[PDB]
Amino acid sequence: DIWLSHWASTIQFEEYYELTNKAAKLSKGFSRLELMKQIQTQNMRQTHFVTVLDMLLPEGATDHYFTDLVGLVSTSHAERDHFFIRPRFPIFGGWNYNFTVGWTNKLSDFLHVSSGSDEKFVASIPILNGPPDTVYDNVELSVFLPEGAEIFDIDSPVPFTNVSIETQKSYFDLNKGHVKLTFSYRNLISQVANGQVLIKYDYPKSSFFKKPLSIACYIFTALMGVFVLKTLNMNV
């Protein structure tokens, strides 16, 4: 899920991975003694299980987080251009792990104002960021334009399975809400599918200032509601 924002001038990436390790399962179960001795012997050559993941993010990424379902995980290291991840348990053959990562880029390098009209924007979104050796069985890319945006044209380099336009209410979406343009891609490769999704929409200043004016409308009708409940005589 990505989140374009014209008031903050920022784009905000959030990703939910449900990864399995389809390698060979391990006989005699799992034993922490053989794993820990296998770490202490030498050098961690190339073997099956997953200890660290290297997330290749866009260029300037600011606020990194890595959470599970039950809480957050503190074993993550966000160095420049690279977001390293250690899960809680090492993912052996056949094991599942569902997690969530997220970061925050500025919008000045993913969004571009068109030439014919000032209030028409064109966004090009990276279709896929992840570890270097992954295969994606299902991808649904939800881009979220702001509340008054109207999508004109949609182009994708990879042939998608599905596309739809809905709305979804986030924080202070008093009216209909964000424009959720969601793509459904089926079969993708991390190394191969180098593409960017191109959305051409408009976002006029008539609908750009309707956010503080809508919150002003709720505060104003709340205070006139206070005025009606204080000019009113109830004294038996």
Partner 1 sequence: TYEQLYKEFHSSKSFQPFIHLDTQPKFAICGLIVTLAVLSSALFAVGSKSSYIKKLFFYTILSVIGSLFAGLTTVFASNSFGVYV
Partner 2 sequence: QPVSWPAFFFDTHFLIWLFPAGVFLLFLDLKDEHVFVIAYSVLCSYFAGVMVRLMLTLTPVICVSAAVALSKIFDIYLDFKIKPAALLAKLIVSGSFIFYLYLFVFHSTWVTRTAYSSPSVVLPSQTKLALIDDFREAYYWLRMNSDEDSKVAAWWDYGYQI
Ligand X SMILES: *[C@@H]1O[C@H](CO)[C@@H](O[C@@H]2O[C@H](CO)[C@@H](O)[C@H](O)[C@H]2NC(C)=O)[C@H](O)[C@H]1NC(C)=O
Ligand Y SMILES: *[C@@H]1O[C@H](CO)[C@@H](O[C@@H]2O[C@H](CO)[C@@H](O[C@@H]3O[C@H](CO)[C@@H](O)[C@H](O)[C@@H]3O)[C@H](O)[C@H]2NC(C)=O)[C@H](O)[C@H]1NC(C)=O
* Span from 37-45, 70-78, 138-146, 161-169 in contact with partner 2 (CB under 8 A): 70-78
Q: Which does 70 bind (CB under 5 to 8 A by kind): ligand X, partner 2, ligand CPL, none?
A: partner 2
165 binds partner 1 (CB under 8 A): no
CB of 63 to partner 1, least distance (A): 8
Q: Which does 164 bind (CB under 5 to 8 A by kind): ligand Y, partner 2, ligand X, none?
A: ligand X
164 binds ligand X (CB under 6 A): yes
Q: Which does 25 bind (CB under 5 to 8 A by kind): partner 2, ligand CPL, partner 1, none?
A: none
* Nearer Cβ to ligand X (108/162): 162
Antiparallel, parallel or unpaired: β 2-5 and 139-145: parallel
Q: 3-class SS at 54?
A: strand
**Looking up tokens 């012997």, which residue turns up?**
41
Cβ–Cβ under 8 Å, residues 3 and 103: no
d(CA 105, CA 13): 8
64 binds partner 1 (CB under 8 A): no
d(CA 71, CA 39): 27
Altogether, the residues listed in the chain come to a count of 236
Give Cα separations from 15 to 7, 18, 102, 108, 130 (angstroms). 23, 10, 6, 21, 9
**Looking up tokens 């979406």, which residue turns up?**
173
Using CB under 6 A, list all residues that contact ligand X: 162, 164, 184
Using CB under 8 A, list all residues that contact partner 1: 3, 5-10, 12, 63, 107-109, 111-115, 121-122, 124, 146-147, 153, 155-157, 170-172, 198, 200, 211-220, 223-224, 226-227, 230-231
Using CB under 8 A, list all residues that contact partner 2: 68-71, 73-74, 88-89, 95-98
